[PDB]
Structures are given as C-alpha cells and as structure tokens.
Design a protein around this ligand. Structure first.
Ligand SMILES: Nc1ccc(-c2cccc(O)c2)cc1C(=O)O
Ligand SMILES: Nc1ccc(-c2cccc(O)c2)cc1C(=O)O
Lengths: 279, 279
C-alpha cells in the first residue's frame, strides 16, 4: 500500500557530501518489476529494497540502478546497513545479496548508526592491456603503477597519478572513455595511509562518481601489491573532492596477493531525508 | 532547519507514469547555491523551490536541474502548481519565474488538485537548416513536415513521422544527436486531435524524456501552421509510451502564426511521494 524510505549519503558524515542511496523498507509486497520502476522514478544511482531473509541472514537486500538490478554494490550496501541500523539493536548485520551474505559491523552513538564496516567479495585482477588507448582518453602519457582491472561484481581499472594536483588536473575525454565497456576507471594519487581517487564510468552511467565503495577494496589490494602499503594496513581514500561530493572510504585487505583472507571497507553515513511513497 | 517536499508525476494521473519533479516548500531560507546542491542530491530532471513572491504573484518558483538553474520549464512548473494546490484554496495560481508570472488554473476534486492548465511563453521559430545531419542521426530519410526549431526558453526541434508505428520504430544514434547543442529533438506522428511524441536531448541530459511540457505548446503551433489542426483547436499529445512513462499533454495555441495571443498547456499530476530533508 505504502512504503517508507530514507535517503542516506554514504561515505559522509555531513548531508550533501558522500554518495546518495535510497533505501526502501518492508518491500516484500513489491515484485521486482515494480522495484525497478521505483528505482527509475527515484533516479538515484541506486535504490535498495529490504526484504525478509531466505538463508539465515537478517534481511535480503535487492539493489537497483534506474535501469537494472545489480548483484553487488559498495556505497548502496553501506547506506542500506546504516539505514537499517535505525530499526535494530544488533551490533552486526548480515545482509543477504545475490552474491551471498555480507557481514556489517554497525557503529552507534546514542542509538544512531553513524558508520559501518563491511566485508567485501575478494576480487580477481589482470592487466587491462589497453594502456595507450586509456591514457589518451584520460589525457596523460603514462601511469605510475601498472594499469590493472579488478573484478568483484563490477570491474574497476586503476590508473595512478604522480601527485594529488595531477589527479585534480585530469579532464578526461568522456566520449573516448565510453569505448571502455562494463568497467569504471579509477584514477588515484597519494602516499602512505592517505590516498585520493576520482572515478569515471560511461559504462555505469556516471560522468564522475562521488564514492565508489566497490573500488575501495581493490585499491587497497593494488597499493599493497605494488609496494605502497602492506597487506593488513588500512588506507583512507578520499574521493569526489573535485566534484564537490567529498567522500571518505576506508579499506583494508588482509593476507597476501595469492591468498587474500578478508577485504574490509568502512565509512560514515548520514540521513539526508526520509519519506513515504504511495505504493 | 528542515524542508518538506513532494514528488509529483506530471502529465500523469497514475504514479510511475508521467515525468517526476521534486517540489520543496518554504525555501526562503535556502541560498541558491544550496538549492542547486539539493537538486543535485535528488538527481531528478528538476527540483523546484517555493519562495515568497516579489512582484505580486502568489509565489516565486526557482527551477533547478542537477547542474543548473532554468528560467522556464514545462513539466516542473505544472507539477509545482499541482503540489502547491494542496496548500491553497485559490482557483488560480500566479507563479513568478525568471521569465515573468505564469497563470495556472487548478482543477480539484474534493480539495485535491488533480490537474492544471498553464499559460506558456509565446515561442519564436525558424528552420533548423541541418536536415540531412539530423535525419541521419535519427535513422530516417525525410520528415513529413518542415524541420523547424522553436524557442520559448529551451529550444525544441520537430521532426514528423508518417505513422505512429514509424515513430515507435525510431532508434536514434544518440552520439550523433549530441552534435545538436542547446536543443531537444521532438519526433511526432498522429492525426486530427491525437498525436504521439518522443523527445531526445543529449544537450538537456536526457536520452529520451517522458513528458516535455515546454514542447507541447510549440507542437500545437507547428501542427496549426502546417495545416493539421486549426489555431484554437486543442490537441492531445501522448509522449513516453515506448519508454514506459506514458504522459498525456494537452495544448492549444490561439490566434494566428503572425499574432499568437495565448499558448496553453495542461495535464494531470499525481503525488508519488512525500518527505522531509534535514536541511
Ligand atoms: N554504482 C555501481 C554501478 C554498477 C555496479 C556493478 C556493475 C556491474 C556488475 C556489478 O555486480 C555491479 C556497481 C556499483 C557500485 O556501487 O558498486
Ligand atoms: N527539462 C528541461 C530541461 C531544460 C530546459 C531549458 C533549457 C534551456 C533553457 C531553458 O529556459 C530551459 C527546459 C526543460 C523543460 O522541462 O522545459
């Protein structure tokens, strides 16, 4: 009959920062075709729907862009966990997805969930093998570190820049980037614990994304493989600064490249708005 | 501190049809930079903001896409008038805009505004002069009626198809259409009182629009000039069918081409959702 929803800015503690997701509660009465139409109506990068669990978790989450269902997504699931924290006292939340059950640790102050940490799927990776084409599209001559593409659901390519100022100076040819299908292009720069990122993806319908949570785990692996951090070291990844949606993602990859045991991504989230829809 | 909003599906009587707009009430405390950030957060084609009047109208409306402020827009203003009807008993609403005050007639049943009619700016027009390029981009050999571009704020080009089935069969090259700057491409077909339309606009950030209210007045003028209806005859324009967002627009242009006295566009609207934001 009606559904309540909230809009969460994921990877932010301040509204209008981070990356929005709409979260719809009590969605068991909605067929998937209707969920898809609602996600299209909202037009946010994703809308999620909270359903009763089917495999022993706390809830089953379905994730929709305006056009299609996704089996996994980073900031939408973080935002969903933070939104659901308003309706449970549990310290941990087990959210079922198409790719299995993901564990979230919820962080509260006086009953309000302000942040969460999630396990992520362990990615696979290989060289992209299209370096000259991609570098030309980005407008630069070379990457710092190897140009590799990671898969954890989505696909994420990483191109390294020699300084944060060089990262901010990028002005990619988005028409040229559109020849890179079913992937996002993540450009990064930094040192030690602190990194900056920018993400561009014609394939995923975004000129430049504010906070690409599914890329944060892969970036931690990339930095560790290429000697910039150790495995097991947390990194801070600040994305979206140039577009006015600063987003802070934290990530850690445990183990070694050949035997990764855990990939964790965490961030703050904040409620931008709350409402009810008429169906 | 907080603001209430509603989501109106304009040019529809059923939720999830028509074309959405978010309408924010009591917006006088928001600087325009903040309105723009809110419109970006919502990511709907437009968000509007209701302000105290400055020139004797009932309210001043500011209209924002996710990227810029607009001086005029069709479905966003229709939706705003319908939303505001919930907060007044007045039969007519005078909404100030950057382009002057627009009169709306509100249609109610038991206190609920179900539809409205608006005056529109009187357009100007000329031949586009890029016919072969545009026809190639649309994938067809010729137009029925002259390919003319109308200006009433936005710019709207009209290309005529020989049947509704031919209109539905269009599969434009959106890359090629992106060479048409600061305009929308409206393709139409029909007869008598009943017409079908499809609108494509890379320039305005929409692959295909559900209901292009600012094009409805121009189309009525185009059809009258080219002998398909008379001036003063209302037409029904059904848009958005192929994309699953059917939208019914009504339009009438009074006078003659050389001396147009009124351009009226009307439609239903319906509330999809209601909420509150935290700033
Ligand atoms: N914003 C997104 C858009 C698309 C995807 C995605 C694409 C292909 C396969 C797949 O499993 C996920 C992910 C995200 C995300 O936020 O992670
Ligand atoms: N959805 C829209 C997007 C852009 C415009 C527009 C563009 C340039 C100048 C201008 O005055 C208005 C109008 C609409 C509309 O709905 O009418």
């Amino acid at each position: 009959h009606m559904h309540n929803y909230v809009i969460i800015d994921a990877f932010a503690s301040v509204p209008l920062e981070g990356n929005p997701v709409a979260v719809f509660f009590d969605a068991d009465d909605l067929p998937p075709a209707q969920m898809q139409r609602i996600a299209r109506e909202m037009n946010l990068s994703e809308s999620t729907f909270v359903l009763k669990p089917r495999n022993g978790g706390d809830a089953l989450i379905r994730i929709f862009t305006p056009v299609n269902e996704l089996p996994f997504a980073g900031h939408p699931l973080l935002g969903t966990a933070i939104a659901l924290g308003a309706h449970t006292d549990n310290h941990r939340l087990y959210l079922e997805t198409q790719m299995g059950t993901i564990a979230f640790e919820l962080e509260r102050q006086n009953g309000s969930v302000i942040a969460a940490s999630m396990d992520q799927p362990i990615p696979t990776w290989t060289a992209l093998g299209r370096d000259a084409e991609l570098l030309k599209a980005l407008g630069i001559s070379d990457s710092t570190f190897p140009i590799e593409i990671y898969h954890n659901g989505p696909r994420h390519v990483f191109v390294g820049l020699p300084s944060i100022d060089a990262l901010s100076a990028l002005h990619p040819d988005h028409r040229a980037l559109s020849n890179f299908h079913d992937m996002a292009i993540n450009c990064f720069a930094g040192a030690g614990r602190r990194w900056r990122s920018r993400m561009f993806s014609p394939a995923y319908g975004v000129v430049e994304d504010a906070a690409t949570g599914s890329a944060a785990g892969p970036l931690a692996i990339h930095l560790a493989r290429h000697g910039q951090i150790e495995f097991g070291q947390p990194v801070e990844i600040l994305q979206g600064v140039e577009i006015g949606r600063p987003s802070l993602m934290f990530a850690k990859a445990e183990g070694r490249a050949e035997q990764l045991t855990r990939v964790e991504v965490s961030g703050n989230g904040v409620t931008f708005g709350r409402g009810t829809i008429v169906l």
